[PDB]
Nucleic acid binder design. Structure first.
Lengths: 80, 101
DNA sequence: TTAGGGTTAG
């Protein structure tokens, strides 16, 4: 539930599935040891970067332009 | 409005002594009910009655605009719908009175 | 005390 910054997160290309059919994909890793600065630090939810990330999601949901979800429209009942 | 001031006095001696009797009850005008009053919580249920009673799904989704939508779009097209009643049109023309707090 | 900045092979 908290916010993190993954310093020196590794990216790596993937191209296969478990049954070895082709599929292009992206991997992510963090190697042991702190050399070069590999690490994580919990971010406080008072940090302006977290405000920027919040700001971003404000568009990613209202102006999402994404297809339907919660087809079970009888589910919410708002403040039930 | 319906009976403005300035009328001739209702002289008693005339009203009685007349042979050609004319009086407040000699000839009269008929009247269909002007401006009745409601109790608020009956006005409210008059409204809330006519709403549900008139709500009509087809009549908000006319074809051929219909018959093309996805279900979700169709439902959200229909999930809100006002209505404006103007009581002063009813017969009788319901005046509205209360205290404001 | 340790560590005392610099790429894993996952």
């Amino acid at each position: 539930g908290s916010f993190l910054r993954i310093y020196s997160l590794h990216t790596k290309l993937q191209s296969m599935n478990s049954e070895n059919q082709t599929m292009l994909s992206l991997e992510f890793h963090l190697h042991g040891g702190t050399s070069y600065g590999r690490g994580i630090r919990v971010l406080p939810e008072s940090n302006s970067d977290v405000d920027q990330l919040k700001k971003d999601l404000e568009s990613a949901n209202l102006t999402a332009n994404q297809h339907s979800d919660v087809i079970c429209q009888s589910e919410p009942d708002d403040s039930f | 409005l319906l009976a403005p001031p300035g009328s001739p006095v209702r002289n008693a001696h005339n009203e009685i002594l007349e042979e050609p009797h004319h009086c407040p009850l000699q000839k009269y005008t008929r009247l269909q009910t002007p401006s009745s009053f409601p109790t608020l919580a009956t006005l409210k249920e008059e409204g809330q009655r006519k709403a549900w009673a008139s709500f009509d799904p087809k009549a908000l989704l006319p074809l051929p605009e219909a018959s093309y939508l996805p279900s979700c779009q169709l439902n959200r097209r229909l999930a809100w719908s006002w209505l404006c009643l103007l009581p002063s049109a009813f017969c009788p023309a319901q005046v509205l009175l209360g205290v404001l707090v």
